[PDB]
Amino acid sequence: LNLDPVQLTFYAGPNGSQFGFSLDFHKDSHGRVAIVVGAPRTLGPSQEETGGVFLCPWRAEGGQCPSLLFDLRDETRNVGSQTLQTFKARQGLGASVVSWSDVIVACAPWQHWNVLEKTEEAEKTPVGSCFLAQPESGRRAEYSPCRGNTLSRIYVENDFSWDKRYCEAGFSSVVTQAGELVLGAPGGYYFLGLLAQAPVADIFSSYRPGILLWHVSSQSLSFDSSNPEYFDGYWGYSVAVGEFDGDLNTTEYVVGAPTWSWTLGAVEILDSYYQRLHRLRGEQMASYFGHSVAVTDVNGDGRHDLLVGAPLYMESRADRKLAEVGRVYLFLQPRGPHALGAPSLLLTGTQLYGRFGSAIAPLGDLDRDGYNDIAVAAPYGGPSGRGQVLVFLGQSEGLRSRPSQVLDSPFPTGSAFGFSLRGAVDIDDNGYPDLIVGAYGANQVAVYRAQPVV
Amino acid sequence: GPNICTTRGVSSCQQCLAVSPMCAWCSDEALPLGSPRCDLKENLLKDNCAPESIEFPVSEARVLEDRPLSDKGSGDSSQVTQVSPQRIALRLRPDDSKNFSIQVRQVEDYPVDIYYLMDLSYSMKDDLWSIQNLGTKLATQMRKLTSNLRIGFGAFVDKPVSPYMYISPPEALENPCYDMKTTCLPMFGYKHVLTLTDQVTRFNEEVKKQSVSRNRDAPEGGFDAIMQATVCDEKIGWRNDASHLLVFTTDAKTHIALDGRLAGIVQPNDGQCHVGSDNHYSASTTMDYPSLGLMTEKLSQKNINLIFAVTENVVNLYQNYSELIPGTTVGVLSMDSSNVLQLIVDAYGKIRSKVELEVRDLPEELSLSFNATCLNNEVIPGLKSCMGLKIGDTVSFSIEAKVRGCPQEKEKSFTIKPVGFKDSLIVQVTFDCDCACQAQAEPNSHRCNNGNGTFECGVCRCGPGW
Amino acid sequence: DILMTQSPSSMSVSLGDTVSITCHASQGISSNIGWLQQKPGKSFMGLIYYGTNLVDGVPSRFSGSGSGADYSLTISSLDSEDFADYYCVQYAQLPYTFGGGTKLEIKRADAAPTVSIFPPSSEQLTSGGASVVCFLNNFYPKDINVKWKIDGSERQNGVLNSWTDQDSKDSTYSMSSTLTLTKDEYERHNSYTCEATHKTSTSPIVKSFNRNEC
Amino acid sequence: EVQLQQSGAELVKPGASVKLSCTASGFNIKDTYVHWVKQRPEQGLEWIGRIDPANGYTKYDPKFQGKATITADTSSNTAYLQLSSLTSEDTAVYYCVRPLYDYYAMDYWGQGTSVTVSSAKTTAPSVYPLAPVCTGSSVTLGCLVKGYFPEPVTLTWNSGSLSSGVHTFPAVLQSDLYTLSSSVTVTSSTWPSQSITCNVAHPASSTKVDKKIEPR
Ligand SMILES: *[C@@H]1O[C@H](CO)[C@@H](O[C@@H]2O[C@H](CO)[C@@H](O[C@@H]3O[C@H](CO[C@H]4O[C@H](CO)[C@@H](O)[C@H](O)[C@@H]4O)[C@@H](O)[C@H](O[C@H]4O[C@H](CO)[C@@H](O)[C@H](O)[C@@H]4O)[C@@H]3O)[C@H](O)[C@H]2NC(C)=O)[C@H](O)[C@H]1NC(C)=O
Ligand SMILES: CN1CCN(C(=N)c2ccc(C3=NO[C@H](CN4CCN(CC(=O)O)CC4)C3)cc2)CC1
Ligand SMILES: *[C@@H]1O[C@H](CO)[C@@H](O[C@@H]2O[C@H](CO)[C@@H](O)[C@H](O)[C@H]2NC(C)=O)[C@H](O)[C@H]1NC(C)=O
Ligand SMILES: *[C@@H]1O[C@H](CO)[C@@H](O)[C@H](O)[C@H]1NC(C)=O
Ligand SMILES: [Ca+2]
Ligand SMILES: [Ca+2]
Ligand SMILES: [Ca+2]
Ligand SMILES: [Ca+2]
Ligand SMILES: [Ca+2]
Ligand SMILES: [Ca+2]
Ligand SMILES: [Mg+2]
Structure with a gap:
């Protein structure tokens, strides 16, 4: 409703760097808000893509941002009559970014890994990896829970049980208020998907450079399965956290699995022990139901609600014809211990191939009426196909069926305006929560400032 | 007695015709003051109205092109008529409705293109062996249905990029089957092998030189290959006037749009051809798998009939996809493709067993209704599609056009075309709302309030600006 | 196997002294070495891992260093509890091998028996x-x-x-x-x-x- | 907190077998590698092998291939070391080890399990008083505990009374039987003025003999 579409702020990274592929707000130890920006194809030292991260100080004029530096050198360790190897080329550092406290977590889902023992090997595979930084102090740490030292032959004998070689950890990421990092790894367990959790504090305290393979005892990983319903389900393609069991001491996980059950798709709610509390099945195969998930209480009852995006949903139209437009589902949490029922509201895109629902950002309470609101991206929507971000306001009965405001992309075609979103943070300290929108195709980020309601 | 034509008390000829399709207008001078000019054509002649001054359009429908339906689709430079009539003229006055017919035949001995698009991941090694004579076997059986057959071949595995592809040791790149005791081809996305040709032995010999590759994950990049086999018209070699059968064989799940991000690929599929002189799909490692909707668009655009020939372990899967891609057929494939021949024949029959009408460019103010006649002269109201047909059968539809009021533009045209067919019925509509006497109006007439009005069709009208 | 030559076999020193134990390998092990402490008539305690990294709970006065095939353990300002046996161990290759050991003893004036x-x-x-x-x-x-x-x-x-x-x-x-x-x-x-x-x-x-x- | 609680000392005969255990405390045994190490005074420390209790795969030093057999049961959260065809040289202290952070390190250690291989039967000691020969300001007596098995033995003077100025030496293996000694020093005015007794207990055979030192 009251985002300002006239005076935007533009940040920009290097050409081709995909600057803005991922972003988040970051607050330093003094509460000063900045913007962490992921640029997963930024060039490294060897003039090869390795990805990069940028920490953008707030400025109404925007402009260039300083780098948040990470080690981009490939590593090798000869230990235990084996040879450990990391490969950072095309690893895609900044394919996801998230801030918690005064710490930044930037991941490279496609960082590769291999272990050599004489003539045998573990195989060179994308275990993924996350880099952690405390910008003020300069502290650095890493977390790569899927790295193993088991040789290829062994996995074959045991029929590829507990095979974490293609995890792509960090593909998605989130951090609980308590400071537990939760990584989505859609390729875990031979492409079933897994989740890796570990306290940020313990990551830092247990990490030392050069070790490459080390234990994080307080970590917790999800489980493998022989149920074919999970096969090629990419469980962890997206991830979020919230309160869904009524016990405020426990933190529940929300996991997207957009190809679950032969591409039906699913989203599951779990306790911190990865035990399943609910499952939402997709409505239409190949819609990618679970591509994006969002948790926020939209109807002001203090119970977290669930939004799910299916960006490839094909709406039914006259003459038995289907039209790919994308869809968003709203699930309101019922009072007390009860299952999430059917969706309370269906929001469906309008522009063909628009991919409405590709991203869903809680905005907090934008217009300050007591109800939290959301923004939905259609990265190729709008009459021009350039992209659109639509705002839907909370209300007592859920969300409004029509948007209160539409943001047309200011960038050229192919920018992917809206592919990444982040809201619910007041960056200019004016008392209204603001929205940052990534457009990695244009290597830029747009900042929309909320203003008093007119 | 009085009617809606008179009781409405119209002001002009144009307003008179807009009352009802039965109303008429008399533009005669010698007409009593009390007598109305807007009445039934019978009542006007009854009141001695000059027959020449009677404006009374009648909604009609006459044919312009009425080529006879061809008995054979063989021969000719595609001078085959599948639909009759091909073009008609339609005249409609306001709020009136006229009707017409259309005939549709599934012509016998129509040419056929069959492109064999084959999963060549490692499990299809046995399949390759059993189809080494498919080209000649297929020719023999299709000869019973057509005399213009062309066939061609393409093959796929998956996007040749980690993690779908094995990338260690260096040997694995040249030979993915290194850690076994055999050799297979380096991984490839999609490769065209054989452009559609009537020389079926070319199919056999190309197949005999083909071999499988090997990749890591069960789902395969077939949808990439379907997209390219569809939109690369010149390379695949689809003919303009022929049935297009795209035969997709696989024994596994398939990658879909947005899967590509596990290989670092986010660029949406552009639905364009990217197969060059090397006959490999060059955007395999840079462009995401295509969505179902985009596939549907291109298949429809190019009139391709997609056939999912898949093994029982994934039939349900592809049957479900088929429901999201109308016009698609599914057949059950043996673990070694030994039955793929009969599968293709059955599919061809099923494909030509339906006639479904479609309308293009229909004006807003026009609405259509359809009464179908399938089988033996059995009329079926409110239906525009027949099923269970055989080659050579003929169906017909009764169509009625109903116009709402009168549109601004007085001449428009739309099209009736069966799905997949080449021929079509063009309907040239004309909206006769005006009167002929208007073309000879007297502006600033000295009969109408001292030049303050216009005299048309025997009455005074307030001129422009009033 | 990799031979771990630890020197000296023993040293006589006093409280507050800064001492250094060395450990020489038969080949490069790239800091894949650990240091251990065994107090008299008791079990072992980890001091250093990967050449220089302190085990959790170990005082900072302890410190490891070196590279290639030559490494050192240093104890700044000896404490009364630091008088004990110390061993190095490499894990660059299986089988793991240990050093001969080094015993820190209390120094004093000579005395006839x-x-x-x-x-x-x-x-x-x-x-x-x-x-x-x-x-x-x-x-x-x-x-x-x-x-x-x-x-x-x-x-x-x-x-x-x-x-x-x-x-x-x-x-x-x-x-x-x-x-x-x-x-x-x-x-x-x-x-x-x-x-x-x-x-x-x-x-x-x-x-x-x-x-x-x- | 991480603790490795091993089994008690074993006392077996040659040719037999024994199975040591290493129970994890404050964590899951399945988390890391578990190693076994052998310690002897002369030979020092020797790496036996390792196991990954998650899957049960093991590695061994080829010197222990045959005798050593490492296993693990995640249920009881314990790791085991089986030794077979035991020999006098298998007499040693055995520790189980795991890393802290580094996958390949050797950081946390168990208290160690003592193993003694011998054919000796439960023999009681022979206590002998050691009086000096037929002068100075300081006198020194002694006590000889010879030919006992197994260890240990508690030796005191005057029933714990005379404690200071005493040197009880470590036991020594003398032909499958242990020998031990102890000395005590006081002033000349103390002895033979005051009675000095050598109290020796051998709980194995349940014997507490006491010999009074008499001059010559
Ligand atoms: C291809 O597409 C088809 C069509 O959608 C899919 O088939 C469906 O699969 C779902 C999921 O397994 C089935 O779900 C359930 O419906 C049952 C009701 O069954 C009746 O009606 C059909 C006729 O329409 C009959 O065939 C059938 O025999 C029954 O008479 C319920 O009993 C099930 O309940 C339980 O599971 C659900 C979770 O799925 C829980 O939420 C419930 O609480 C309960 O515990 C379930 O609701 C559905 O029946 C299937 N339909 C058909 C027609 O078969 C294929 O799976 C799909 N294949 C692939 C590969 O994609
Ligand atoms: C014990 N239990 C076993 C299953 N499990 C898994 N997590 C798991 C799930 C799925 C798979 C696979 N699917 O498919 C792949 C098989 N491949 C055959 C050869 N194919 C070559 C080619 O087609 O070119 C490619 C496909 C592997 C493997 C393991 C849990 C533990
Ligand atoms: C579709 O079929 C219906 C009959 O089911 C046709 O309708 C009847 O048509 C006659 C024609 O004179 C009318 O007199 C009847 O009143 C109609 N009955 C109805 C509508 O219930 C209809 O004309 C057919 N339409 C076309 C386009 O052929
Ligand atoms: C017009 O409709 C009538 C009745 O529906 C039908 O008899 C007549 O044949 C139709 N006209 C044409 C040209 O088909
Ligand atoms: Ca909870
Ligand atoms: Ca709520
Ligand atoms: Ca609000
Ligand atoms: Ca603000
Ligand atoms: Ca086969
Ligand atoms: Ca594949
Ligand atoms: Mg396959």
Whole structure:
């Protein structure tokens, strides 16, 4: 409703760097808000893509941002009559970014890994990896829970049980208020998907450079399965956290699995022990139901609600014809211990191939009426196909069926305006929560400032 | 007695015709003051109205092109008529409705293109062996249905990029089957092998030189290959006037749009051809798998009939996809493709067993209704599609056009075309709302309030600006 | 296998001293080395891993360093608890191999031993055995050599020695040598002697007695 | 907190077998590698092998191939070391080890399990008083505990009374039987003025003999 579409702020990274592929707000130890920006194809030292991260100080004029530096050198360790190897080329550092406290977590889902023992090997595979930084102090740490030292032959004998070689950890990421990092790894367990959790504090305290393979005892990983319903389900393609069991001491996980059950798709709610509390099945195969998930209480009852995006949903139209437009589902949490029922509201895109629902950002309470609101991206929507971000306001009965405001992309075609979103943070300290929108195709980020309601 | 034509008390000829399709207008001078000019054509002649001054359009429908339906689709430079009539003229006055017919035949001995698009991941090694004579076997059986057959071949595995592809040791790149005791081809996305040709032995010999590759994950990049086999018209070699059968064989799940991000690929599929002189799909490692909707668009655009020939372990899967891609057929494939021949024949029959009408460019103010006649002269109201047909059968539809009021533009045209067919019925509509006497109006007439009005069709009208 | 040569075998030092133990490998191990502590009559405690990284709970006065095939453990300002056994261990290759070990001992002023010889008890003689005992108590340094003489001539067969750890009080050492003979063989001779050689005297400290005579 | 609680000391005969255990405390045994190490005074420390209790795969130093057999049961959260065809040289202290952070390190250690291989039967000691020969300001007595098995033995003077100025030496293996000694020093005015007794207990055979030192 009251985002300002006239005076935007533009940040920009290097050409081709995909600057803005991922972003988040970051607050330093003094509460000063900045913007962490992921640029997963930024060039490294060897003039090869390795990805990069940028920490953008707030400025109404925007402009260039300083780098948040990470080690981009490939590593090798000869230990235990084996040879450990990391490969950072095309690893895609900044394919996801998230801030918690005064710490930044930037991941490279496609960082590769291999272990050599004489003539045998573990195989060179994308275990993924996350880099952690405390910008003020300069502290650095890493977390790569899927790295193993088991040789290829062994996995074959045991029929590829507990095979974490293609995890792509960090593909998605989130951090609980308590400071537990939760990584989505859609390729875990031979492409079933897994989740890796570990306290940020313990990551830092247990990490030392050069070790490459080390234990994080307080970590917790999800489980493998022989149920074919999970096969090629990419469980962890997206991830979020919230309160869904009524016990405020426990933190529940929300996991997207957009190809679950032969591409039906699913989203599951779990306790911190990865035990399943609910499952939402997709409505239409190949819609990618679970591509994006969002948790926020939209109807002001203090119970977290669930939004799910299916960006490839094909709406039914006259003459038995289907039209790919994308869809968003709203699930309101019922009072007390009860299952999430059917969706309370269906929001469906309008522009063909628009991919409405590709991203869903809680905005907090934008217009300050007591109800939290959301923004939905259609990265190729709008009459021009350039992209659109639509705002839907909370209300007592859920969300409004029509948007209160539409943001047309200011960038050229192919920018992917809206592919990444982040809201619910007041960056200019004016008392209204603001929205940052990534457009990695244009290597830029747009900042929309909320203003008093007119 | 009085009617809606008179009781409405119209002001002009144009307003008179807009009352009802039965109303008429008399533009005669010698007409009593009390007598109305807007009445039934019978009542006007009854009141001695000059027959020449009677404006009374009648909604009609006459044919312009009425080529006879061809008995054979063989021969000719595609001078085959599948639909009759091909073009008609339609005249409609306001709020009136006229009707017409259309005939549709599934012509016998129509040419056929069959492109064999084959999963060549490692499990299809046995399949390759059993189809080494498919080209000649297929020719023999299709000869019973057509005399213009062309066939061609393409093959796929998956996007040749980690993690779908094995990338260690260096040997694995040249030979993915290194850690076994055999050799297979380096991984490839999609490769065209054989452009559609009537020389079926070319199919056999190309197949005999083909071999499988090997990749890591069960789902395969077939949808990439379907997209390219569809939109690369010149390379695949689809003919303009022929049935297009795209035969997709696989024994596994398939990658879909947005899967590509596990290989670092986010660029949406552009639905364009990217197969060059090397006959490999060059955007395999840079462009995401295509969505179902985009596939549907291109298949429809190019009139391709997609056939999912898949093994029982994934039939349900592809049957479900088929429901999201109308016009698609599914057949059950043996673990070694030994039955793929009969599968293709059955599919061809099923494909030509339906006639479904479609309308293009229909004006807003026009609405259509359809009464179908399938089988033996059995009329079926409110239906525009027949099923269970055989080659050579003929169906017909009764169509009625109903116009709402009168549109601004007085001449428009739309099209009736069966799905997949080449021929079509063009309907040239004309909206006769005006009167002929208007073309000879007297502006600033000295009969109408001292030049303050216009005299048309025997009455005074307030001129422009009033 | 990789040979781990740890030096020195032992060192005599005092509280507050800054000392350094070294460990040489037969080949490069690229900091894949650990350091261990074993306090007297107790189990092991990890000190260092991967060359330089302190184990959780270890004081900062400990520190590891070096590269290639030469590494060092350093202890700045020795504490009373730091006097113990230390070992290096490489895990660059299987099988893991350990260093010889290094014992930190308390340094002090030299001190001559108090020698004392004891003929066979009456009880033992009536049973058919004969053991001459020679105690050498409270001396420093630990390096000492005992020599038994029967009728002036050296004897090496049937000697049994035992040493104590560095005493907690005076930080001195003590030794017990025992010469066992049969009753029959014990009476073939008259004079029995044990000579003590220490750096506190060029002349050996002699103590002896004569059988029958007293 | 991480603790590795091993089994008690074993006392077996040559040719037999024994199975040591290493129970994890404050964590899951399945988390890391578990190693076994052998320690002897002369030979020092020797790496036996390792196991990954998660899957049960093991590695061994080829020197221990045959005798050593490492296993693990995640249920009881314990790791085991089986030794077979035991020999006098298998007499040693055995530790189980795991890393802290580094996958390949050797950081946390158990208290160690003592193993003694011998054919010796439960023999009681032979206590002998050691009085000096027929002068100075300081006098020294002694006590000889000879030919006992197995260890240990508690030795005191005057029933714990005379404690200071004493040196009880470590036991020594003398032909499958242990020998031990102890000395005590006081002033000349103390002895034979005051009675000095050598109290020796051998709980194995349940014997507490006491010999009074008498001059010559
Ligand atoms: C291809 O597409 C088809 C069509 O959608 C899929 O088939 C469906 O699969 C779902 C999921 O397994 C089935 O779900 C359930 O419906 C049952 C009701 O069954 C009746 O009606 C059909 C006729 O329409 C009959 O065939 C059938 O025999 C029954 O008479 C319920 O009993 C099930 O309940 C339980 O599971 C659900 C979770 O799925 C829980 O939420 C419930 O609480 C309960 O515990 C379930 O609701 C559905 O029946 C299937 N339909 C058909 C027609 O078969 C294929 O799976 C799909 N294949 C692939 C490969 O994609
Ligand atoms: C014990 N239990 C076993 C299953 N499990 C899994 N997590 C798991 C799930 C799925 C798979 C696979 N699917 O498919 C792949 C098989 N491949 C055959 C050869 N194919 C070559 C080619 O087609 O070119 C490619 C496909 C592997 C493997 C393991 C849990 C533990
Ligand atoms: C579709 O079929 C219906 C009959 O089911 C046709 O309708 C009847 O048509 C006659 C024509 O004179 C009318 O007199 C009847 O009143 C109609 N009955 C109805 C509508 O219930 C209809 O004309 C057919 N339409 C076309 C386009 O052929
Ligand atoms: C017009 O409709 C009538 C009745 O529906 C039908 O008899 C007539 O044939 C139709 N006209 C044409 C040209 O088909
Ligand atoms: Ca909870
Ligand atoms: Ca709520
Ligand atoms: Ca609001
Ligand atoms: Ca603000
Ligand atoms: Ca096969
Ligand atoms: Ca594949
Ligand atoms: Mg396959």
